[PDB]
Amino acid sequence: GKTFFGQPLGLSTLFMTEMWERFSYYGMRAILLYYMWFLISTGDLHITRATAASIMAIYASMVYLSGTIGGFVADRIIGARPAVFWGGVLIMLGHIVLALPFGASALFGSIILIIIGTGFLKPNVSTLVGTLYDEHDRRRDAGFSIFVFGINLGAFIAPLIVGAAQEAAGYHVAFSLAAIGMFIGLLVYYFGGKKTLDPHYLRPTDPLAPEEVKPLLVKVSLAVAGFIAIIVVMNLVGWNSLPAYINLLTIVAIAIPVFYFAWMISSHLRVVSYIPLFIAAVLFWAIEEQGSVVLATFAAERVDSSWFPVSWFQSLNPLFIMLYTPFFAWLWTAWPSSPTKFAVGLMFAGLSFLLMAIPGALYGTSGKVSPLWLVGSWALVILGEMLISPVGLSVTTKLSQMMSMWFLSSSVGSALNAQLVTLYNAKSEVAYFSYFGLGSVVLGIVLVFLSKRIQGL
């Protein structure tokens, strides 16, 4: 029978939908920080570079958090297929906003649009992949792997294409390419979906019952009122700078999992066992998410890249994932506990940062070093990713609220980054990499020691 790599044909539509959406997202990620440096350098945007770095991290943190809500809105209110569509429209508008002839004044609107749009789309394209398969279809794992390959393909080519356009034709043209990529995704998604997706998913599959509407409304309104209350009090007492708002969002992103732990623990052994795994994932993702902030800074300031666009380094994360997956797929069938995998994963992340301490220690920080240092850094952190990422969902489910905590681990890690990356600068380079690299190796060794008990729990 006709398939797409052995899978139902609908996977082709969803593969390309996600590939082009990830193209738009990671094309933006690869130039947004440099764009803020440019807006800063012309006096248009009145922040420090450290705040610009902080923004990048909390942006990612909010995007991951937003994805924790989009499943519910689709399943219970609008349906999965319209969530992916309108989510894509919002993503597209978010890039259009940065393509328009504005400067710093458009940044917040773009960020809000992409936060909301990505939160609608990302959980719900993954849902639709599952809908391709009946309950006990054994292809299900294979289809999701092919899907993830589409994600990485889009992440790989976007910095190449969008980053080259940015240097040749300017930031506005480059962001317009991100919007067009999403537009392409919407075209394939809309017309391909009708031919291959079940019309059942045009509507919520668990619509709010009559008595559930009001409690939901009350709960949302109380949250909005509380948040706005905190913001007026912040402005009355004079905590109204941009870093003050970033600290508020940091606190919110960390509090949400902390309150969930307190809920489950006080309302038991397995849950206690998950604290060190969640912390290990948080720290892994912190380092991994710094590729686009701290390593991107290092790439622009300290690497000799005179002959190629410096945003291209952002292709190495997905490149290594793609290159490594055959070897790791063979390893998991030829061959370790998940707590051991997390600990070794954190150690590789720590090594990836220790490695970057060497060129400044050996050559000084005033010159430029070879791109191969960053190539080796991403090689190491992605090695850890191959250990932690394929199992993270599994371990957290082996042990609904908590299922979402796996996805929150990368939001918390990015929120931690919003604080940490403000410490990175030309003068702190070597100590920053040394401290956080060694610190992550040491905690990886701690988790190794704890790995047996956790295995029991």
Ligand SMILES: CCCCCCC/C=C/CCCCCC(=O)OC[C@@H](O)CO
């Ligand atoms: C099984 C996974 C393999 C990945 C391991 C990769 C480890 C990376 C080590 C760093 C090597 C790059 C540093 C060498 C370098 O910078 O060369 C500079 C020189 O070419 C310029 O004069």
Ligand SMILES: CCCCCCC/C=C\CCCCCC(=O)OC[C@@H](O)CO
């Ligand atoms: C049980 C472990 C909890 C995980 C928390 C992760 C670490 C969180 C905060 C560490 C912040 C202090 C680092 C400041 C620092 O010394 O950086 C060094 C460098 O910037 C200059 O020497």
Ligand SMILES: CCCCCCC/C=C\CCCCCC(=O)OC[C@@H](O)CO
């Ligand atoms: C597959 C299992 C991997 C197990 C690896 C065990 C740990 C490997 C290497 C530990 C090296 C950490 C040394 C850090 C270091 O020397 O930095 C010193 C520097 O920070 C002093 O300022």
Ligand SMILES: CCCCCCC/C=C\CCCCCC(=O)OC[C@H](O)CO
């Ligand atoms: C300039 C005026 C714009 C007014 C906005 C109203 C837009 C109304 C319809 C736009 C056409 C796209 C709707 C299709 C849709 O609902 O997608 C969900 C599912 O994917 C349908 O297969």
Ligand SMILES: CCCCCCC/C=C\CCCCCC(=O)OC[C@H](O)CO
């Ligand atoms: C579902 C969570 C929704 C949370 C919404 C609040 C998050 C809003 C923005 C993310 C943090 C970005 C703040 C910095 C920023 O917006 O840059 C604006 C320009 O710097 C203007 O100076």
Ligand SMILES: CCCCCCC/C=C\CCCCCC(=O)OC[C@H](O)CO
């Ligand atoms: C609903 C269709 C949405 C499709 C994506 C929207 C992008 C469409 C066209 C992009 C045109 C934007 C040109 C960017 C631009 O003006 O460059 C400015 C230069 O810096 C100097 O003019």
Ligand SMILES: CCCCCCC/C=C\CCCCCC(=O)OC[C@H](O)CO
């Ligand atoms: C965080 C701010 C964003 C808040 C947006 C969430 C919207 C909150 C409540 C929306 C109510 C959902 C529509 C109600 C509804 O469709 O009722 C139909 C029922 O299925 C039949 O009784």
Ligand SMILES: CCCCCCC/C=C\CCCCCC(=O)OC[C@H](O)CO
């Ligand atoms: C921006 C978030 C602050 C809270 C405002 C969100 C509330 C938006 C809509 C709530 C309207 C109540 C929904 C009831 C409803 O329309 O259901 C109709 C039934 O389906 C009747 O057949």
Ligand SMILES: CCCCCCC/C=C\CCCCCC(=O)OC[C@H](O)CO
């Ligand atoms: C949901 C309604 C609550 C109000 C809008 C939600 C936005 C949430 C957090 C705002 C944090 C981003 C602040 C953006 C900004 O430009 O602040 C910087 C100040 O202008 C510095 O003086």
Ligand SMILES: CCCCCCC/C=C\CCCCCC(=O)OC[C@H](O)CO
């Ligand atoms: C699921 C629970 C959600 C809990 C969210 C609680 C957030 C409560 C308070 C946050 C207020 C702290 C922000 C103000 C602040 O830190 O100022 C930063 C700088 O010191 C100002 O210069």
Ligand SMILES: CCCCCCC/C=C\CCCCCC(=O)OC[C@H](O)CO
């Ligand atoms: C599908 C594999 C195609 C070949 C690798 C794709 C390259 C994508 C991004 C490269 C990021 C920039 C790295 C620059 C670099 O590695 O140059 C190393 C040179 O040997 C140093 O002169």
Ligand SMILES: CCCCCCC/C=C\CCCCCC(=O)OC[C@H](O)CO
């Ligand atoms: C268990 C997987 C670990 C992968 C091992 C491969 C990495 C082997 C050595 C990495 C050390 C990188 C430093 C190389 C170095 O410092 O050379 C610098 C030269 O001066 C550049 O000309």
Ligand SMILES: CCCCCCC/C=C\CCCCCC(=O)OC[C@H](O)CO
């Ligand atoms: C298995 C391959 C792993 C390759 C990475 C090995 C990393 C091991 C050690 C690198 C740590 C270098 C620290 C450099 C340092 O802190 O020196 C400080 C100097 O005084 C410069 O301020």
Ligand SMILES: CCCCCCC/C=C\CCCCCC(=O)OC[C@H](O)CO
């Ligand atoms: C010059 C560097 C100093 C040498 C450091 C290398 C030490 C390498 C590994 C130490 C790990 C200690 C093993 C403890 C352990 O694994 O416990 C066994 C159980 O499986 C733990 O749950």
Ligand code: NA
């Ligand atoms: Na360059």
